[PDB]
Amino acid sequence: MYRYKPLLQSIHLPNGIKISNRFVLSPMTVNASTKEGYITKADLAYAARRSNSAGMQVTGAAYIEPYGKLFEYGFNIDHDACIPGLTNMASTMKQHGSLAIIQLAHAGRFSNQAILNFGKVYGPSPMTLHSPIEHVVIAMSHEKINSIIQQYRDATLRAIKAGFDGVEISIAQRLLIQTFFSTFSNRRTDHYGADSLKNRARLCLEVMRAVQEVIDKEAPDNFILGFRATPEETRGSDLGYTIDEFNQLIDWVMDVSNIQYLAIASWGRHIYQNTSRTPGDHFGRPVNQIVYEHLAGRIPLIASGGINSPESALDALQHADMVGMSSPFVTEPDFVHKLAEQRPHDINLEFSMADLEDLAIPHAAFKDIVKMMDYGEGLKK
Structure with a gap:
């Protein structure tokens, strides 16, 4: 029995769509779009290279309005003139039958580009x-x-x-x-x-x-609604919200919308070190474990947080149904094929400037490529 077999097993979403493996290509802002956020040739080349990489793909942030924009050259989805370019993007991403999910984003007060553009941003409190x-x-x-x-x-x-x-x-x-x-x-x-x-x-x-209402009225059959969240918020020994509050939130989200998965985010934290600070039975347990228990098989959980290897992917399946990787797909877009072909030793996350064209990486400067990769999950490896 091949050790990495579980990662290659198919899975059905709640809506019956079948995904042929457990890998998800995680959100990555390439930062190669036009200033207006229109899809460029560089954007398309990057996505094309990765269209056969994983069972499902989630785009980098696509901003819903000007005051919600974080990255200077990220995707825009805030007006109809974006549709032609986004149509090319969806087609490019779907060409090998990998599912293509676009992430809709509003960065609130953290909308760095909006800060620069307008000197003002929006949030709950002044x-x-x-x-x-x-x-x-x-x-x-x-x-x-x-x-x-x-x-x-x-x-x-x-x-x-x-x-x-x-x-x-x-x-x-x-x-x-x-x-x-x-x-x-x-x-x-x-x-x-x-x-x-x-x-x-x-x-x-x-x-x-x-x-959900828009999807019900407008979407093709089985159009997927995904959800991504950070299960708790801490600062020292205070919590901005507890993991029990988060669990209640996701129950309420399921009451009002047909979400198909939960993707866990842990910016700046590795999966192996992401434990809960919620007092009580949860305290010190892995965040993914607590969330996976609460989901109770209602929807698949997608784990993330520096997963970068056959072994880290396999281990993540202990408290998840699917595994998302960000930077590994930048330098090793064929990761899952090497795994499927039972060649795990061939996986290589290193790259030289000689690889930039085969990898279809838009940026010439090594420091920009590194910054791009590190920003997704907020880790340095």
Whole structure:
């Protein structure tokens, strides 16, 4: 029995779509789009190279409105002129039958490009800040919140029209929705405020319901709704939200929307060292274990966090159904083929400047390629 066999087993999503292996190509912002965020030849070449890499692929962040933009040259999905380029992207990504999911993003106060463009960004609660430049964080009015919900509806429809297989709503650390769920950042006293878990969840639940409704009315059969999240938020020995609160949130998300998977994010933390700080029975247990237990097989869990090898992929399956990798697919796009062919020793994550064309990496500078790779999962290996 081949040691890595479990990673090659097929899986069905809740909606009946069959994925032929357990690998997911994780979100990666290549930072090679136009200033408006339109899909470029470089974007397409990068994706083409990786269209036969994994059972399922999730794009880097595609921003839903100008004030939500993080990366300077990331994907845009905020207006209809984006559709032609995104249509090329979806087609490119789907050409070998790998599923192509576009991540819809709004970075709230962490929308670095919006800070530079406008000197102002939006969040649950007001702030005046000095880094990266002097800017203000404006508390979102109810009108602004409604417009954001509409922008998620609009972006979902654009993804559908572009021929993607699905969308992923990310609410991970440093996303607008996360900043409403956290009691560190959300100091509001209205119905989107810190007073109750329902109030903190409200923005997330309104978005998921709105997106589900668009899919119901507009999407091809079995269009996939994905969900990505950071299961707890800590700062020293305080929590901005507990893993039990997160577990309640995902139960509520399932009540309002037909999510097909949960992808766990742990920016700046390796999977082997990502343990819970929620007091009680959870304390010190692996975050993926706690979440996997709570999911109770309702939807597949996609593990991530520096997974980079046959052995780390296999180990992740102890508390997950699928494994996502970010930077390994940058330098080793054929990882899963080598594994399927029972050649795990052939996997090589090193690259020289000689490989840049075969790998279809847009950036010439080694320091930019490194920065690109490291930013996805926030690790340095």
